[PDB]
Structures are given as C-alpha cells and as structure tokens.
Amino acid sequence: VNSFSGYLKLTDNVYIKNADIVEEAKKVKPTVVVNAANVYLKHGGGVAGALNKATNNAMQVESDDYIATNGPLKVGGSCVLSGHNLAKHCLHVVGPNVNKGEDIQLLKSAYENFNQHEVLLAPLLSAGIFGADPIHSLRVCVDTVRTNVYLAVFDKNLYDKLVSSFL
Ligand SMILES: OC[C@@H](Cc1c[nH]c2ccccc12)Nc1ncnc2[nH]ccc12
C-alpha cells in the first residue's frame, strides 16, 4: 500500500492520472520523482522547468555541479540527484527530443531506467515539448517498465485521450 490517490490502473504495475506532477510530488513526497531532463540538465521548460521552479532553483544549482563534474548525460540515460522539497530523490531521465532529430527508438532505453526503482512518480517521457506522440510514449512505458509507475498527465484533454485509446 502507498499514498498515491485517484489513479486509474492500466496494468499490473502502471497507473495514470490527470495531474500536475509538481502538485502531486508536493502532496505525496514520493521516494522518486522522475524529471523529463535533457543531457545538460538545463531545466528550462516543460516538466523540468516546473520542477526546478518548485525547488526555488536548487535543482538547477545541484545539476550544474553534477554536469561540471561528470559531463552531459546520454540520450536514453539518467542520473539520481536530490528530490529537494518534492521527493527523496529525483531521477533525471533523458528521453529523445524529436524536435532535435533524436532517435525515437531511444525512448525504450529511457524508460528502462525506471526499472532500477521500485516505485516512481513520473511524466510521459518525450511527450509535451519533447515532441513525441504521448500515446506511443504510454505504450512504450507499459511495455518496458516493470516496477510500479504512477504517471501524471498535465493536460486533461490529453489524459482523456490516453485512457480512451489505451489497449
Ligand atoms: O504536456 C505533456 C507532459 C509531459 C512532458 C515532458 N516534457 C515536457 C516538456 C514540456 C512540456 C511538457 C512535457 N507535461 C506535464 N505532465 C505532467 N506534469 C507537468 N507539469 C508541468 C508540465 C507537465
């Protein structure tokens, strides 16, 4: 039993809800919140900009030190950093950004990072401003993640479409 509330169950391990991931994380304080990161951990917009803003820029400060030490992530890769006031940990995961020409096949690799954590709050990778079809992202999530994932979909109209079209 966990404290996630109001989710629709899609499969044995995947749940989905129309919610603002920032407000959800503040309420649940999950062990792991997933950020929709880029390789530079520059948290400008989308989910990343919103999470970082909610940390009063502490996420960005921590991220800049991470990059200065380690260099950029790989597309499809991840790193674990602090969750600040939102969660114990933040798993920064880089899905392909179609608006940069990146290979959508890397979306499965991106979701594989979730399997290193028993329970996660997460957005749909590569959706929104990353330019991929959210229906496809949800399919890859369900077919790749085996741990317990709670998906927050910000756009209510998109949430209804994802549920109604789910196979
Ligand atoms: O809109 C699709 C969806 C996934 C997404 C990944 N990256 C993005 C970059 C820009 C815009 C959107 C995205 N957005 C969100 N889903 C849940 N909570 C959210 N809080 C703030 C935004 C947001």
Q: How far away, in angstroms, is 75 Cα from ligand 1 center?
A: 18
Q: Give the amino acid at 14.
A: V
Whether the Cβ atoms of residue 80 and residue 89 lie closer than 8 Å to each other = yes
Q: How far away, in angstroms, is 21 Cα from ligand 1 center?
A: 8
Phi, psi dihedrals of residue 152, rounded to the nearest 5°: -105, 120
Whether 146 is covered by a domain: the verdict is: yes
Question: What are the percentages of helix, strand and coil residues in the chain, rounded to 5?
Answer: 40, 20, 40
Whether 34 is covered by a domain: the verdict is: yes
Preceding residues of all breaks in the chain (C to N beyond 2.5 angstroms)?
none
Strands in the chain per DSSP E: 8-9, 14-18, 32-36, 78-82, 89-93, 119-122, 148-153
Token look-up 């927050």 returns: 152
Closest residue by Cα to atom 9, ligand 1, is: 46
Whether the Cβ atoms of residue 126 and residue 97 lie closer than 8 Å to each other = yes
* Inter-axis angle of helices 46-54 and 21-28, nearest 10: 40
> Pairing between strand 119-122 and 148-153?
parallel
How many CB atoms are closer than 10 A to CB 47? 26
Task: Choose among 151, 126, 107, 162: nearest CA to 19.
Answer: 151
Closest residue by Cα to atom 5, ligand 1, is: 128
Instruction: Tokens for 36, please give them.
Output: 């929709």
Cα atoms in the 13 Å half-sphere on the side-chain side of 94: 17
Token look-up 């369900």 returns: 142
Whether 114 is covered by a domain: the verdict is: yes
The domain that holds 87 is classified in CATH as 3.40.220.10
Q: How many domains does the chain have?
A: 1
3-state secondary structure of 155: coil
Whether 77 is covered by a domain: the verdict is: yes
Whether 1 is covered by a domain: the verdict is: no
The CB of 133 under 6 Å from ligand 1? The reply is: no
- In angstroms, the CA 96 to CA 32 distance is 21
Determination technique for this entry: X-ray
Whether 2 is covered by a domain: the verdict is: no
CA 4 to chain CA centroid, Å, is 16
The CB of 130 under 6 Å from ligand 1? The reply is: yes
The CB of 54 under 6 Å from ligand 1? The reply is: no
Structural resolution in Å: 1.0
- In angstroms, the CA 47 to CA 41 distance is 12
Whether the Cβ atoms of residue 145 and residue 13 lie closer than 8 Å to each other = yes
Q: What are the residues facing 92 on neighbouring strands?
A: 35, 79
> Residue 111 belongs to what domain range?
8-163
Cα atoms in the 13 Å half-sphere on the side-chain side of 77: 10
Task: Choose among 123, 108, 105: nearest CA to 46.
Answer: 123
